[PDB]
Each structure stands twice: as C-alpha cells, then as structure tokens.
C-alpha cells in the first residue's frame, strides 16, 4: 500500500522471536521460506533493514520495522 505491510512484519517478528530476537540471513530466510515467503521479498526486507550489511537481522533492526510501519500507516494518512 505505502512502503511496508504490517502483515510482513508479523511473519518476520514471529520467526525472530523463535530464534531469540536474533537470526541470520540463512536462518530467518529458511524460517521465512517455510512460511511461503519468496527469496525476493525476504531479500528486500532484509536488505532494506540490514543497513549494517552484516547479513544478520537482530531485535534492533526489527524494532525499526514496527516504527517505520507506524510512521507511514499510523499518525497520518492523506496528510
Ligand atoms: Ca544487520
């Protein structure tokens, strides 16, 4: 709709919680692939958030996800 979908975060959030708030590209991706998530979609989300390019997504990176989602889909609309 805008930039990110709350539905996506739910998928990544759940898988992240299972790994202990921390997971690597390979582990999260496998957990994502088993849910029906495409590599392209995962790579975009992972690249988008993995600003450190450490090929790893942590609770910190995921935190921005929820924040970035609310600044767009929350507190505003038509502007
Ligand atoms: Ca990272």
From Swiss-Prot:
Result, substituting residue 55 to G: Strongly increases calcium binding affinity
Substitution effect: residue 8 to A: Decreases phosphorylation
Domain EF-hand, residue spans: 37-72
Post-translational modification: Phosphorylated. Phosphorylation is important for protein function; a mutant that lacks the N-terminal phosphorylation sites cannot complement a zebrafish pkd2-deficient mutant. PKD-mediated phosphorylation at the C-terminus regulates its function in the release of Ca(2+) stores from the endoplasmic reticulum. N-glycosylated. The four subunits in a tetramer probably differ in the extent of glycosylation; simultaneous glycosylation of all experimentally validated sites would probably create steric hindrance.
Localization annotation: Cell projection, Cilium membrane; Endoplasmic reticulum membrane; Cell membrane; Basolateral cell membrane
Binding positions for Ca(2+) 2 per the UniProt entry: 50, 52, 54, 56, 61
Tissue expression notes: Detected in fetal and adult kidney. Detected at the thick ascending limb of the loop of Henle, at distal tubules, including the distal convoluted tubule and cortical collecting tubules, with weak staining of the collecting duct. Detected on placenta syncytiotrophoblasts (at protein level). Strongly expressed in ovary, fetal and adult kidney, testis, and small intestine. Not detected in peripheral leukocytes.
Basic and acidic residues bias locations: 57-79
Protein task: Forms a nonselective cation channel. Can function as a homotetrameric ion channel or can form heteromer with PKD1. Displays distinct function depending on its subcellular localization and regulation by its binding partners. In primary cilium functions as a cation channel, with a preference for monovalent cations over divalent cations that allows K(+), Na(+) and Ca(2+) influx, with low selectivity for Ca(2+). Involved in fluid-flow mechanosensation by the primary cilium in renal epithelium. In the endoplasmic reticulum, likely functions as a K(+) channel to facilitate Ca(2+) release.
Subunit structure: Homotetramer. Component of the heterotetrameric polycystin channel complex with PKD1; the tetramer contains one PKD1 chain and three PKD2 chains. Isoform 1 interacts with PKD1 while isoform 3 does not. Interacts with PKD1L1; probably forms a Ca(2+) channel. Interacts with CD2AP. Interacts with HAX1. Interacts with NEK8. Part of a complex containing AKAP5, ADCY5, ADCY6 and PDE4C. Interacts (via C-terminus) with TRPV4 (via C-terminus).
Disease: Polycystic kidney disease 2 with or without polycystic liver disease: An autosomal dominant disorder characterized by progressive formation and enlargement of cysts in both kidneys, typically leading to end-stage renal disease in adult life. Cysts also occurs in the liver and other organs. It represents approximately 15% of the cases of autosomal dominant polycystic kidney disease. PKD2 is clinically milder than PKD1 but it has a deleterious impact on overall life expectancy.
Family, as annotated: Belongs to the polycystin family.
Protein name, UniProt field: Polycystin-2
Residues of the full protein shown: 717 to 792 of 968
């Amino acid at each position: 709709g805008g930039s990110l979908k709350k539905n996506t975060v739910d998928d990544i959030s759940e898988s992240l919680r299972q790994g202990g708030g921390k997971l690597n590209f390979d582990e999260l991706r496998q957990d994502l692939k088993g849910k029906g998530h495409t590599d392209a979609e995962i790579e975009a989300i992972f690249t988008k958030y993995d600003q450190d390019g450490d090929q790893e997504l942590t609770e910190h990176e995921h935190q921005q996800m929820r924040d970035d989602l609310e600044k767009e889909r929350e507190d505003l609309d038509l502007d």
